[PDB]
DNA sequence: GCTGCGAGATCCGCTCCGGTG
DNA sequence: CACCGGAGCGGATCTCGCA
DNA sequence: GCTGCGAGATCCGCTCCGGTG
DNA sequence: CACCGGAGCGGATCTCGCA
């Protein structure tokens, strides 16, 4: 532990990873990793390997991107939760044409939110106003990050493959595109052999708001909750409603965190209802 | 299965297939079959018409029962454009039957060949059903009135048509607040469930059936055709009573 | 099973994967996969996802590639088994200069075989004769496949990083390159904290041929062997020497396969030695 | 008759030690 | 005295980008 | 105040059925 | 009668390349 200054000097001179230094001078690897963190050259030359994710979100939250196939502009519209897709060819990527396509889209379906990249048509102020005009949240992804729209990119690849497989069988490129839409919307099935269109229909049936509104008549009970650390709980903090009661646990909301949280039934006491 | 009970109730009261499946939760196709077989009373059915408005030709697609409608501007009335429109329409929906008049585009040989390729029933001739015809004229009048209503506000003619489609499919409501889109979605969901549960499994198969009296099995009767084979039970008709009964698969001899 | 012709017709028309067809028409998925195999469009558009490998080989089997750093030509020499490396800068990639570098290399170490890409210096007939002149096997990798020399590519990346980290501390670029060689040959240690140079030295000590030659005096025994299929063995095929005897199994060579093979001691009968 | 791999960074599984009821 | 993280040790696992 | 995923192809783990000692 | 692949079923796992 007394050789730590010499280890730091060697790190400054040569800049090897902490594992070798730990195995050599017998210093805990936490100290060596902190040395690497507090150094300069290794800090400047280390790489940020992170996993991140994708915005699957919920029902009716879609994103889109353009298609460059055979020097023809095509719009492909992709669902995230169920997996449905839809596409149509357009002469250009102009704002007015994009607005017309979006209006037809919103006539056909009932979306809620839309994601997109920094494309001029997507970013256009009139398009943003129209999206606001129909009460739909429009968020722009960070520029030069196709992984945000990786879903539409994957669907793009699959649709191009299906066009390659299906184009010579029909007279019209639009007809072939419709056939590929059928292939990837009704025929493309996996797992339980259920179409993305069927998933979307079932999602709409569940999302029907009449049942959700009328479920309010169910009995509501109150309770306290506490947090467990090393098996040692805290105080019974705050009265909150029993959102649902399960076997061995319930569902509660913490106003401090403003998010949903689960507590085992052992740390829960039931409040009797009015009588 | 409550389907044979529904069919007995139909043999008693002779109500329409609509109220039948609404109030007994039975297949729409089964209700149509029962209406067809019931001589007292004797899905995805569409009608297509052409109409001009500022000298523009537009396809009109109206479903005969739920009331959902669809429209799209077209350059001309000729067969190739009709084929493209019907290809897009079949891409967007999953129809089962179509009713139309004797228009050249409808009666074109290649159009009917592509109908057969898609495997859907096509019927041409003079429309004789007031139930569908009057709905067609009502849809036409309402659509033209709403488009005259909404055109000045919108920049694009196609945008105005899309807005009128929104008004006539989502905003407009009837009964307990059910849109044509809502009723179409409900019927489509139930129809697809019953199709995947009953249709593709087996067809036109005969069998032997027996009736249990206080648990005692009866003599094998028939033979009769298996019309609706479900989970652990089938629907067959007793010839004497002209009624359908629930017979468990353990009491059925499958005739090859 | 009678719907197979219709399934084949649908495959010819639309060309979806076998899983969906199997889940739809209730046909065994082997038949559908064979249909896809015997079709044409899916055969033409399927992708060959294979894993392959790398030629780690044994001791003293190396490969090399050139370095394009700061518009300066550098030769980097990489070991595969132990992990040692060595490098030196050269003005150009000419055949004579490469021959001089190889001769210095063979003076410094005692290699056995060398791998390389389609580089003109590596492919030169005089270089091949010189490699033959020193009794070293030279094989050329398939062109335009850097994954064959992925080892030297990885070492290239690491050495460039270490140059970036170490260049300003020395006057001469050659001195910095030597320092990076020290870093990656003596300091870069993992696992048991043992240097690649130490691994190479121990490999040479083990590969010393005197012990291998003098091990022949060990007793040699003969035996038969058989192959097990479903628990049913065959005939006792061929007399072969007991190369080594272990606990529950031995080592034998099959002249039919001309490779080494292991048989459990249960299927082995010991031949008594001469007495 | 031939051939993708490894530095680097957090997280976690874990085991003696700890607080902890 | 049982129990769970705490810390240390060791291993498991992710993208990336070199040619 | 934000965000890589999924068609496609072999191999394998496995469970009733089989040969098999 | 125990035992191991055989075949079928289902799941586990690999690179790649789309923008």
Coordinates of N, CA, C and O in Angstrom, one line a residue, chain A residues 12-17 19-20 23-24 41-42 45 161 164-166 169 179 182-183 187-193, chain C residues 12-17 19-20 23-24 41-42 45 161 164-166 169 179 182-183 187-193:
Chain A
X12 N 1.7 7.1 -14.9 CA 1.9 8.4 -15.7 C 2.9 8.2 -16.8 O 2.8 8.7 -17.9
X13 N 4.0 7.4 -16.5 CA 5.0 7.1 -17.5 C 4.5 6.3 -18.7 O 4.8 6.6 -19.8
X14 N 3.8 5.2 -18.4 CA 3.6 4.1 -19.3 C 2.1 3.8 -19.7 O 1.9 3.5 -20.8
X15 N 1.2 4.0 -18.7 CA -0.2 4.0 -18.9 C -0.7 2.6 -19.4 O -1.2 2.4 -20.5
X16 N -0.5 1.6 -18.5 CA -1.1 0.3 -18.7 C -2.4 0.2 -17.9 O -2.6 1.0 -17.0
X17 N -3.2 -0.9 -18.2 CA -4.4 -1.0 -17.6 C -4.2 -1.4 -16.1 O -3.2 -1.9 -15.7
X19 N -5.5 -3.8 -14.3 CA -5.4 -5.2 -13.9 C -4.0 -5.7 -13.8 O -3.6 -6.4 -12.8
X20 N -3.2 -5.3 -14.8 CA -1.7 -5.7 -14.7 C -1.1 -5.1 -13.5 O -0.3 -5.8 -12.8
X23 N -2.2 -7.0 -10.4 CA -1.5 -8.3 -10.3 C 0.0 -8.2 -10.0 O 0.6 -9.2 -9.5
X24 N 0.6 -7.1 -10.4 CA 2.0 -6.9 -10.2 C 2.3 -6.5 -8.7 O 3.1 -7.2 -8.0
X41 N -4.2 10.7 -19.6 CA -4.0 10.1 -21.0 C -5.0 8.9 -21.1 O -5.7 8.8 -22.2
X42 N -5.1 8.0 -20.1 CA -6.1 6.9 -20.2 C -7.5 7.5 -20.2 O -8.4 6.9 -20.9
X45 N -8.2 8.5 -23.7 CA -8.2 7.5 -24.7 C -9.1 6.3 -24.4 O -9.0 5.3 -25.2
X161 N -35.9 -6.6 -49.5 CA -35.8 -8.0 -49.9 C -37.0 -8.6 -50.5 O -37.0 -9.3 -51.5
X164 N -37.4 -7.4 -54.0 CA -36.6 -8.1 -54.8 C -37.2 -9.5 -55.2 O -37.0 -10.0 -56.3
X165 N -37.8 -10.1 -54.2 CA -38.4 -11.4 -54.4 C -39.7 -11.4 -55.2 O -40.1 -12.4 -55.7
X166 N -40.4 -10.3 -55.2 CA -41.8 -10.2 -55.7 C -42.0 -9.3 -56.9 O -43.1 -9.4 -57.6
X169 N -43.5 -10.4 -60.7 CA -44.8 -11.1 -60.7 C -46.0 -10.2 -61.0 O -47.1 -10.7 -61.2
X179 N -48.4 -5.8 -52.4 CA -48.2 -7.3 -52.2 C -47.2 -7.5 -51.1 O -47.3 -8.4 -50.2
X182 N -48.8 -6.8 -47.8 CA -49.6 -8.0 -47.4 C -48.7 -9.0 -46.8 O -49.0 -9.6 -45.8
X183 N -47.5 -9.3 -47.5 CA -46.6 -10.3 -47.0 C -46.1 -10.0 -45.6 O -46.1 -10.9 -44.7
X187 N -49.0 -12.2 -43.7 CA -48.3 -13.5 -43.9 C -47.2 -13.7 -42.9 O -47.0 -14.8 -42.4
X188 N -46.4 -12.6 -42.6 CA -45.3 -12.7 -41.7 C -45.8 -13.0 -40.3 O -46.2 -12.0 -39.6
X189 N -45.7 -14.2 -39.9 CA -46.2 -14.6 -38.6 C -45.2 -15.5 -37.9 O -44.5 -16.3 -38.5
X190 N -45.1 -15.3 -36.6 CA -44.2 -16.1 -35.8 C -44.7 -16.4 -34.4 O -45.7 -15.8 -34.0
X191 N -44.0 -17.3 -33.7 CA -44.5 -17.7 -32.4 C -45.8 -18.4 -32.4 O -45.9 -19.5 -32.8
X192 N -46.9 -17.7 -31.9 CA -48.2 -18.3 -31.9 C -48.9 -18.2 -33.3 O -50.1 -18.5 -33.4
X193 N -48.1 -17.8 -34.3 CA -48.7 -17.7 -35.7 C -49.8 -16.7 -35.8 O -50.8 -16.9 -36.4
Chain C
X12 N -44.2 -20.8 -54.1 CA -43.7 -20.3 -55.4 C -44.3 -18.9 -55.7 O -43.6 -18.0 -56.2
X13 N -45.6 -18.7 -55.3 CA -46.2 -17.4 -55.5 C -45.6 -16.3 -54.6 O -45.4 -15.2 -55.1
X14 N -45.4 -16.6 -53.3 CA -45.3 -15.5 -52.4 C -43.9 -15.6 -51.6 O -43.4 -14.5 -51.2
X15 N -43.4 -16.8 -51.4 CA -42.1 -17.0 -50.8 C -41.9 -16.5 -49.4 O -41.1 -15.6 -49.1
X16 N -42.7 -17.0 -48.5 CA -42.5 -16.8 -47.1 C -41.7 -17.9 -46.4 O -41.6 -19.0 -47.0
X17 N -41.2 -17.6 -45.2 CA -40.4 -18.6 -44.5 C -41.2 -19.8 -44.1 O -42.4 -19.8 -44.1
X19 N -41.4 -21.4 -41.3 CA -42.1 -21.5 -40.0 C -43.5 -21.1 -40.1 O -44.4 -21.7 -39.5
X20 N -43.8 -20.0 -40.8 CA -45.2 -19.5 -41.0 C -46.1 -20.6 -41.7 O -47.2 -20.8 -41.3
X23 N -46.8 -23.4 -39.2 CA -47.8 -23.0 -38.2 C -49.1 -22.9 -38.8 O -50.1 -23.0 -38.1
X24 N -49.2 -22.6 -40.2 CA -50.5 -22.4 -40.8 C -51.2 -23.7 -41.2 O -52.3 -24.0 -40.7
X41 N -36.3 -18.9 -55.7 CA -36.1 -17.5 -55.3 C -35.5 -17.4 -53.9 O -34.6 -16.7 -53.6
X42 N -36.0 -18.2 -53.0 CA -35.5 -18.2 -51.6 C -34.1 -18.7 -51.6 O -33.3 -18.3 -50.8
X45 N -31.9 -15.9 -52.6 CA -31.9 -14.8 -51.7 C -31.6 -15.1 -50.2 O -31.7 -14.2 -49.4
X161 N -2.9 2.5 -30.7 CA -3.4 3.2 -29.4 C -2.2 3.5 -28.5 O -2.1 4.6 -27.9
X164 N -0.2 6.4 -29.7 CA -0.9 7.6 -29.4 C -0.7 8.0 -28.0 O -0.6 9.2 -27.6
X165 N -0.7 7.0 -27.1 CA -0.5 7.3 -25.7 C 1.0 7.6 -25.3 O 1.2 8.2 -24.2
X166 N 2.0 7.2 -26.1 CA 3.4 7.3 -25.7 C 4.3 8.1 -26.5 O 5.4 8.4 -26.1
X169 N 6.6 11.3 -25.3 CA 7.5 11.1 -24.2 C 8.9 10.8 -24.6 O 9.8 10.8 -23.8
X179 N 9.3 1.3 -27.2 CA 8.6 1.4 -25.9 C 7.3 0.7 -25.9 O 6.8 0.0 -25.0
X182 N 7.8 -2.9 -25.7 CA 8.0 -3.3 -24.3 C 6.6 -3.4 -23.6 O 6.3 -4.3 -22.9
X183 N 5.8 -2.4 -23.9 CA 4.4 -2.3 -23.2 C 3.6 -3.6 -23.5 O 3.0 -4.2 -22.7
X187 N 4.8 -5.7 -20.3 CA 3.9 -5.1 -19.4 C 2.5 -5.7 -19.5 O 1.8 -5.9 -18.5
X188 N 2.0 -5.9 -20.8 CA 0.7 -6.3 -21.0 C 0.5 -7.8 -20.5 O 0.9 -8.7 -21.2
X189 N 0.0 -7.9 -19.3 CA -0.2 -9.2 -18.7 C -1.6 -9.4 -18.2 O -2.2 -8.4 -17.7
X190 N -2.1 -10.6 -18.2 CA -3.5 -10.9 -17.8 C -3.6 -12.3 -17.2 O -2.6 -13.1 -17.3
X191 N -4.7 -12.6 -16.6 CA -4.9 -13.9 -16.0 C -3.9 -14.1 -14.8 O -4.1 -13.5 -13.8
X192 N -3.0 -15.0 -15.0 CA -1.9 -15.3 -14.0 C -0.8 -14.2 -14.0 O 0.2 -14.5 -13.3
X193 N -1.0 -13.1 -14.7 CA 0.0 -12.1 -14.7 C 1.3 -12.5 -15.3 O 2.4 -12.2 -14.7

